[PDB]
């Protein structure tokens, strides 16, 4: 029963068990138009530590700690899927809703980009059934729902003792967002940069999951 | 289960205090991943506020001196005939050609801005681009 | 050697300055039945309509010419604490190439 203990104790001792430093650079984030922002009239107060500056009332994200944010953001996700995490891509935006719902499909995981029906996370125990494994990690691509308010699953998931690693805008509110990354969430180049990135982080985690399962049955 | 008070502290704090008090008999997964690899900012709940009085925003304006060169370039020539292709990374338009020539002519040391402007017009005419000044 | 301030000092959006009546090329990635969506770079896109001239010439993938009105078009109203956006920029169409 110690082999299961050792198979998870080993990856907790390195800053990159899957080497995710290579999965992006600062050049690709600039070349996927992530650094742009909304009008400075719509600029939110909690974004002032995550904004480089303002270009003619268009707000620029400080992309340096964005990578440092994304380093632990990808580190959190791929450590979780190593230990068989249930990852929920909640992204209430009807411009990339078709893209994301196959991203969880071809990464073996789950997504809910539809209208959020009421007691979803909180009253799970009769909406789904008596015993139901709730998601252990919930990724947000658009934290604003289509009325430009905080999506209720942001307020719901952290209430359910579940961490949230979102893409946070320059008009969002990253208060109960545990591993936010300040990024554009509106352009198709930027969300395709995301949808390629999280797809890589799950899949790079899963092949190094299966090899150490072969490592127990290597000797025995 | 545990707590649903999102306003007590961060989720790591409540889960830590709750498992350490030992009512919880099972430690969650993301807890081990959290204290193993922590985030930069603890995500503790904050009610937002509103700036009142002489408080303003500490987010600056982003300017350069080449922006001031582009200012007089746009006041005279407007946009040049070269329509911008913003998929082009190194799209050096007539504003960019004007300002690059202006910088390497400020490297001459002509203090007068008008002869810098005019010799820049001559360097662009030596390059081969027709200037569409509203005369 | 390549820093962050280096990437956006001479970036084209800083190169062109303010988007008050400047010529820009932009392409088509979505069409709904009257309307074509013009992704010209920057944060959002703009939507416009098929003119009768070159009617089925404006298709999926063609470049057009834009006049570039302002990039987001937001305004705070009377009793709102924050302005609402439209996620558009809505420039004026000219022609091709």
């Amino acid at each position: 029963t110690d082999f299961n203990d050792k198979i998870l104790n080993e990856p907790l001792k390195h800053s990159d068990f899957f080497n995710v430093k290579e999965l992006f650079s600062v050049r690709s984030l600039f070349d996927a138009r992530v650094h742009l922002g909304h009008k400075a009239g719509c600029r939110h107060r909690f974004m002032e530590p995550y904004i480089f500056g303002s270009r003619l009332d268009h707000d620029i994200i400080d992309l340096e700690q964005t990578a440092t944010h994304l380093q632990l953001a990808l580190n959190f996700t791929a450590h979780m899927a190593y230990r068989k995490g249930i990852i929920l891509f909640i992204s209430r935006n009807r411009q990339f809703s078709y893209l994301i719902e196959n991203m969880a499909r071809d990464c073996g995981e789950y997504a809910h980009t539809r209208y959020f029906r009421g007691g979803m996370l909180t009253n799970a125990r009769l909406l789904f059934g008596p015993t139901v494994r709730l998601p252990d990690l919930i990724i947000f691509l658009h934290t604003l729902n289509n009325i430009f308010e905080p999506h209720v699953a942001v307020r719901d998931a952290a209430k359910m003792n579940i961490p949230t690693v979102g893409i946070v805008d320059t008009n969002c509110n990253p208060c109960l967002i545990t591993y936010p990354v300040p990024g554009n969430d509106d352009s198709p180049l930027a969300v395709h940069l995301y949808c390629r990135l999280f797809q890589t982080a799950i899949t790079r985690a899963k092949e190094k999951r299966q090899q150490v399962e072969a490592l127990y049955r290597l000797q025995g | 289960a545990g707590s649903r008070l999102e306003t007590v502290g961060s989720i790591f704090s409540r889960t830590r205090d709750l498992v350490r008090a030992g009512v919880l008999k099972e430690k969650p997964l993301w807890f081990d991943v959290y204290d193993a690899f922590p985030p930069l900012r603890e995500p503790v709940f904050q009610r937002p506020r509103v700036r009142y009085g002489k408080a303003k925003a500490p987010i600056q304006d982003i300017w350069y001196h080449e922006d001031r060169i582009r200012a007089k370039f746009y006041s005279v020539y407007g946009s040049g005939q070269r329509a911008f292709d913003l998929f082009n990374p190194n799209f050096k338009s007539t504003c960019q050609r004007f300002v690059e020539k202006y910088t390497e002519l400020q490297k001459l040391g002509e203090t007068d801005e008008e002869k810098l402007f005019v010799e820049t017009g001559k360097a662009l005419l030596a390059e081969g681009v027709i200037l569409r000044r509203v005369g | 050697v390549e820093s962050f301030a280096s990437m956006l000092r001479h970036s084209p959006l800083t190169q062109m300055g303010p988007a008050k009546d400047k010529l820009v090329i932009g392409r088509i990635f979505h069409i709904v039945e009257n309307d074509l969506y013009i992704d010209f770079g920057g944060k959002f896109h703009c939507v416009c309509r098929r003119p009768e001239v070159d009617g089925e010439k404006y298709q999926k993938g063609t470049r057009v010419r834009l006049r570039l009105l302002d990039l987001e078009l937001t305004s705070r109203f009377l009793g709102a604490t924050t302005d609402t956006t439209v996620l558009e920029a809505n420039a004026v169409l000219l022609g091709i190439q």
Binding site: - | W63, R68, A71 | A5
Partner: peptide, 25 residues
């Protein structure tokens, strides 16, 4: 490093439109 923006007084700023009878008496 030297590409850092420098806090100056906002170019591209249009000069404010006087009324039609402004400099007149």
């Amino acid at each position: 490093n030297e590409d850092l923006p420098i806090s100056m007084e906002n170019p591209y700023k249009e000069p404010l439109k006087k009324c039609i009878l402004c400099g007149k008496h």
